[PDB]
């Protein structure tokens, strides 16, 4: 009987389904997490503030949510000040931000190491303003040391009215420069839109190389660009060979589509996977607090979140420590956290797009860097 709050974007359904599946799967005899869900537009600071305040007035012990580059500082500041634990699939903040458990592993190292693996000298980098500019700073800073010539273009300012025109103009300009190598750091929807536009401009022909940088490599559709011939590389967070993942695949594919939106798929989006694993982590965190015989109860209501001077609630510290000490097995692989709330010990599958389908060419660990795993005409 644990009160927990939650914050969901009105547009992303599969994350909620995965959340509910996590609820059913990880529920136990002794206690069952009770979610209070709020669907709202994520980029709105006001909405986030009111959601968080409503969740806090009910005195929820922890909050699982999503945030956007526009909504992030409200969250970090509120959770930091009022001592409420925040668990998120969203892009990890760069810094010391307290009371935030970030479920997503850091993508920078794999990206840079991969850039080094292909020995790319000059390349193009398309960055989306909303997902955060951290990785832009990364590839530029590293380009300073590595002599790399990098053309960085902001793709995130496009209107609903004009879509194909801007991308056609941009790739026309990149056709003038005749650059064959493109790096895409973008959300999966924009990734697929840009891909469709590329296919229309016919730049998926041989001689081109694309790197899709996200953990959603198989989330986006690789099928239309598969027979194209231009080599595409990406990063897969979920290895489908592993038994836990396979079990989750049978369960996910089993579900009636109507009850759980978009569940029938044989493949699951990585954000949803992180959501599920986050449910797992919360459950195990409170079990951990139970085995330390620490009282999870709050003697009174936390009250108003804006009350001045701010009243931090004590138990939240213990909760945060619990969530950070959690080490579990999940869809994302080994799950561990440092003090900042970042993932560590994590491993990422480096994948190349091949004629038969997506394959695993290698793997990346923070300690191990880039690691390759080894994988006809007659001659007169």
Ligand X SMILES: *[C@@H]1O[C@H](CO)[C@@H](O)[C@H](O)[C@H]1NC(C)=O
Per rule CB under 6 A, is residue 288 in the interface with ligand X? no
Site string for ligand X, 301-330 (x = CB under 6 A): --------------------------x---
Site string for a copy of itself, 296-335 (x = CB under 8 A): ----------x-x-x-------------------------
Which of another protein, ligand X, a copy of itself, none interacts with 334 (beta carbon under 5 to 8 A by kind)? ligand X
Nearest-CA neighbor of 221 among 178, 267, 264?
Answer: 267
For residues 231, 237, 238, 244, the Cα torsion angle rounded to the nearest 10 degrees is 150
Binding residues for a copy of itself, total number by CB under 8 A: 48
Phi/psi region, residue 106 (left: phi>0; alpha: psi -120 to 50; beta: rest), is beta
Residues 77-106 that bind another protein (CB under 8 A): none
Which of another protein, ligand X, a copy of itself, none interacts with 39 (beta carbon under 5 to 8 A by kind)? none
Q: Which is closer to ligand X, CB of 57 or CB of 334?
A: 334
Other C-beta atoms lying within 10 Å of the C-beta of residue 350? 22
Contact 184, 194 (CB under 8 A): yes
CB of 362 to ligand X, least distance (A): 16
Per rule CB under 8 A, is residue 3 in the interface with a copy of itself? no
Per rule CB under 8 A, is residue 59 in the interface with a copy of itself? no
Contact 310, 83 (CB under 8 A): no
CA dist 368 to 233, 266, 348, Å? 19, 31, 11
Helix axes 164-176, 188-201, angle to 10 degrees: 60
Per rule CB under 6 A, is residue 49 in the interface with ligand X? no
Nearest-CA neighbor of 281 among 80, 42, 94, 88?
Answer: 88
Chain residues binding ligand X by CB under 6 A are 327, 334, 336, 345
Chain residues binding another protein by CB under 8 A are 119, 121, 147
């Amino acid at each position: 009987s644990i009160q927990i709050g939650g914050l969901f974007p009105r547009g992303a359904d599969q994350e909620y389904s995965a959340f509910r599946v996590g609820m059913v799967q990880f529920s136990t005899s002794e206690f069952r997490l009770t979610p209070h869900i709020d669907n709202l537009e994520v980029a709105n600071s006001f909405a986030v503030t009111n959601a968080f305040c409503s969740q806090f007035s009910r005195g929820v012990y922890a909050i699982f949510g999503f945030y956007d580059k526009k909504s992030v500082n409200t969250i970090t500041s509120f959770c930091g000040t009022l001592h409420v634990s925040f668990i998120t699939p969203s892009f990890p903040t760069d810094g010391t931000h307290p009371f935030v458990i970030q479920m997503r592993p850091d993508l920078k190292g794999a990206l840079l190491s991969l850039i080094e693996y292909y020995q790319w000298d000059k390349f193009a980098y398309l960055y989306d303003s909303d997902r955060g500019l951290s990785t832009l700073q990364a590839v530029l800073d590293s380009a300073a040391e590595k002599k790399w010539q990098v053309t960085a273009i902001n793709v995130g300012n496009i209107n609903n009215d004009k879509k194909d025109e801007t991308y056609r103009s941009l790739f026309q300009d990149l056709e003038l420069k005749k650059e064959r190598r493109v790096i895409l750091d973008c959300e999966r929807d924009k990734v697929n839109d840009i891909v469709d536009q590329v296919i229309t401009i016919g730049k998926h022909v041989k001689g081109y190389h694309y790197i899709i940088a996200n953990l959603g490599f198989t989330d986006g559709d690789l099928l239309k660009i598969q027979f194209g011939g231009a080599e595409v590389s990406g990063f897969q967070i979920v290895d489908y060979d592993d038994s836990l993942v396979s079990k989750f695949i049978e369960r996910w594919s089993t579900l009636e589509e109507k009850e759980y939106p978009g569940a029938h798929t044989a493949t699951i989006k990585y954000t949803s996977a992180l959501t599920y694993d986050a449910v797992q982590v919360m459950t195990e965190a409170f079990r951990n607090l139970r085995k330390q015989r620490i009282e999870i109860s709050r003697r009174g209501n936390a009250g108003d979140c804006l009350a001045n001077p701010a009243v931090p609630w004590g138990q939240g510290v213990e909760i945060e420590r619990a969530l950070k000490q959690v080490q579990v097995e999940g869809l994302s692989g080994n799950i561990k956290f440092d003090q900042n709330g970042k993932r560590i010990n994590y491993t990422i599958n480096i994948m190349e797009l091949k004629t038969n389908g997506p394959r695993k060419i290698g793997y990346w660990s923070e300690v191990d860097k880039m690691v390759v795993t080894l994988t006809e005409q007659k001659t007169v």
